[PDB]
Amino acid sequence: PLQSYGFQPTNGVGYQPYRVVVLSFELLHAPATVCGPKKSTNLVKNKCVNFNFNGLTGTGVLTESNKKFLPFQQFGRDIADTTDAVRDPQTLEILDIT
Partner 1 sequence: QCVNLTTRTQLPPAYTNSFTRGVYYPDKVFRSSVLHSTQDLFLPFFSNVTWFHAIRFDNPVLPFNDGVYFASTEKSNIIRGWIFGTTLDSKTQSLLIVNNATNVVIKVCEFQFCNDPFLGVWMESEFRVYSSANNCTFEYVSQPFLMKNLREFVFKNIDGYFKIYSKHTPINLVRDLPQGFSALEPLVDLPIGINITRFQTLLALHAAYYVGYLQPRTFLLKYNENGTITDAVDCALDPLSETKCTLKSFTVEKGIYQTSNFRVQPTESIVRFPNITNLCPFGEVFN
Partner 2 sequence: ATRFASVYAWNRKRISNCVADYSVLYNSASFSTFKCYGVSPTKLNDLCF
Ligand X SMILES: *[C@@H]1O[C@H](CO)[C@@H](O[C@@H]2O[C@H](CO)[C@@H](O[C@@H]3O[C@H](CO)[C@@H](O)[C@H](O)[C@@H]3O)[C@H](O)[C@H]2NC(C)=O)[C@H](O)[C@H]1NC(C)=O
Positions touching ligand X (CB under 6 A) are 90-92
Distance, CA of 74 to CA of 52 (rounded, Å): 13
User: Are the C-beta atoms of 26 and 14 separated by less than 8 Å?
Assistant: no
User: Are the C-beta atoms of 37 and 61 separated by less than 8 Å?
Assistant: no
Residue 2: name its binding partner from partner 2, ligand X, partner 1, none (Cβ under 5 to 8 Å by kind): partner 2
Candidates 24, 36, 67, 91; binder of partner 1 (CB under 8 A) is 67
Residue 18: name its binding partner from ligand X, partner 2, partner 1, none (Cβ under 5 to 8 Å by kind): partner 2
Q: Does 73 bind partner 1 (CB under 8 A)?
A: yes
CB nearer to partner 1: pick between 12 and 71: 71
62 C-beta neighbours (distance < 10 Å), count: 22
